[PDB]
Structure 1
Amino acid sequence: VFDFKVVVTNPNAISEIEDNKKNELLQRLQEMITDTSISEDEYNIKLEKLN
């Protein structure tokens, strides 16, 4: 067999420095789809993808 998948070693262990980095990245995506969507035409389309 060959399934050398990258796994999380402790998947039930979420911390605060993990949550501040997810909160920073999710605020980074909102600056993108505000700029790349043209006046609410696809703004509710991309928001359903990152929901």
Structure 2
Amino acid sequence: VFDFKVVVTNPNAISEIEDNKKNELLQRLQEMITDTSISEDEYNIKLEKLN
């Protein structure tokens, strides 16, 4: 058998320095969508891609 998956060793262990990095990336992902979306047409769609 051959399944070699990258897995989280402790998946229920979320800390502060993991959480402050995820909020930083979603701030970057929010920053991108204000530039790419022609306003009011696909801005709701990309939000449904990142809700």
- The TM-score with structure 2 as length reference comes to 0.96
CA–CA distance in structure 2, aligned partners of residues 48 and 2 of structure 1: 35
State the 4+ residue runs in structure 1 displaced beyond 2 angstroms: none
Q: What is the RMSD computed on CA atoms of the aligned residues?
A: 0.5
Q: In structure 1, list runs of 5 or more residues that go unmatched.
A: none
- The TM-score with structure 1 as length reference comes to 0.96
* Deviation sequence 1:21-45 (CA, Å, 0-9, x none): 0000010000111100001110000
CA–CA distance in structure 2, aligned partners of residues 31 and 6 of structure 1: 29
Q: In structure 2, list runs of 5 or more residues that go unmatched.
A: none
Give the aligned partner of residue 10 of structure 1.
10
